[PDB]
Design a protein around this ligand. Sequence first.
Ligand SMILES: [Mg+2]
Ligand SMILES: [Mg+2]
Ligand SMILES: [Mg+2]
Ligand SMILES: [Mg+2]
Lengths: 341, 341
Amino acid sequence: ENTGFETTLIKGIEPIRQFVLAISIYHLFDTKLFSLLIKHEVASPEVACNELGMEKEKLLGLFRYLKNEGILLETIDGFSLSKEGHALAPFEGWYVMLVGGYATTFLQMGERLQEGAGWATRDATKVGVGSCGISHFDAIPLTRSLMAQAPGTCTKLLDLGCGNGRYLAEFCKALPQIQAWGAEPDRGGFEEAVDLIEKEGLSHRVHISHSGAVEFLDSDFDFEPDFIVLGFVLHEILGQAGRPAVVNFLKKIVHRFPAINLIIIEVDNQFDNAGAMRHGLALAYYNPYYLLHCFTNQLLVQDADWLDIFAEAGLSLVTRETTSDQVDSTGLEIGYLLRRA
Amino acid sequence: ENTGFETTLIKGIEPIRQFVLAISIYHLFDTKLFSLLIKHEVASPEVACNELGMEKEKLLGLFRYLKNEGILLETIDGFSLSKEGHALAPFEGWYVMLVGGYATTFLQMGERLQEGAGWATRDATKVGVGSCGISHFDAIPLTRSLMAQAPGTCTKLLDLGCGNGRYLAEFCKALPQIQAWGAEPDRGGFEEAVDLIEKEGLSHRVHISHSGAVEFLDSDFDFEPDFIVLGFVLHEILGQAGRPAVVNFLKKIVHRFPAINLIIIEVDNQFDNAGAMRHGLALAYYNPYYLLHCFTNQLLVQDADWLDIFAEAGLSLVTRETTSDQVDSTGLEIGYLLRRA
Ligand SMILES: [Mg+2]
Ligand SMILES: [Mg+2]
Ligand SMILES: [Mg+2]
Ligand SMILES: [Mg+2]
């Protein structure tokens, strides 16, 4: 008879309902429909189609789906973002990083679980673009706070793994004397960085290279930085190349630039910490982030493990801070300001 | 200052938290880890790895992620499904169909919105396997109810678009005199059907063909069915081949088999119906289902549109029913029992 089945089904597939909604919100941002709705206020499918080069019947389908979920309103004049839709605006970076960048990674987990199946791949351009959007709220303010605590003033900034160059665009706008260099290994991300720097009118002060971190430090670049920022880059090197390679990379930075100030941002691996994992943001963001990092060739370690790598590399801790508790109060995102020992 | 941002972020990315959970629940079923946990009760990662040929560190990552979400329990002896994990068991078909089958389809929507970009693709094997799992609850009981209302007893059953052959396996077990034939166009689904029929010991009574519906009816098969089941197949033909092709296909069925009883199951397209779309199941399942059908080459129409196609094909409605209100009370899944006019 299946007595009471429907009520259990509606609850049982609530993760699928939200799965489709998350992908649909990601497309709303990524296709530039969200920005179109912000600019137009109300747009007919015909107007949105003409502007973005889209097909009306498919756009109507997406719009009707979002209207049923309350993200859009529909009037005789067309569609608009509802208050709930407008409220999604600050979270674009998270949708672009985790859906755009990592949907394929999560979908590959079943196959990648097999012995010898290798690491899950990702869309590194979207990971970089999304992570740079997120960084406006957490990592850039943390980097700024640590930079201000350093004894020397920043004049020549090097950002390795710069994504779309958001840290450099923000820092250079705020601090007009700075000359900067960024390196980004993903071609798509590198091209977005070159474009963002040009759009911000910073091309005369900021140069971007298409390069990985280790290979950039081995290259024959002429820059003499006094600050180097390593935002979530060391855990990539640690997984890909190993702990000796991370220690050697850090040793090379202070051998080449003995007076340099290093700012490292890392995620403390507390995936196995009961209390930490009950925090709302630990569940919403860090639990999927830790899962991705078991399937990709990156390795997250604990705060104590990073401090031990820094000591082995001959670095001294100046200060360590976490993000503002107004944005992320988990204590899992840690920033370190270091100097040569 | 970003005052109060974190609280808004946790709510703002709740769809992403559930997006990752839905994919992870899908892998738990699809990889056979869910069945392993049911059989073992408690399993160490080492034991699960040896049985399924998996890598321990990746499995531990998935298990830790699911434990943090409350799907698994961890003791010194290993991992087990929690009560919440056990409660997911009946919903396997929905995860396999919508995540396994259609995740790629949803992820393709951004690109497919572009003028001339074509139809989004899907993993038809997983769509078929998942939809057959769902059919145990809604469409098979509906088909059984309509068959019982037909004047003649079923002796030779033809099921077009049979997926993994679940309708035939269920009907033939319940009704021992039946000879049956199934046709499934997806090779993966066809192979699963051949295997399920063999596993159920029905190979002497049930034959499966790797064929689409229209091409099967045009073939030189020797079967003389007295019942034909078209479960969610006509909307595929309607989208792919057009309304005249659907009318012609139905006309061919009753020209070849004048005394045949047809059972058609369709989804009423009420995507634009305010009241219908507020039902919990309309939001959880039908709203994503309607969205997929705007991006794939299938077309959902309304109950009245199907009745008009049946009249044009020279068919008479014997009776029409919806699914049991214990499983799906939306009224959107409609079954029709037809005969030649
Ligand atoms: Mg990372
Ligand atoms: Mg890893
Ligand atoms: Mg369909
Ligand atoms: Mg269609």
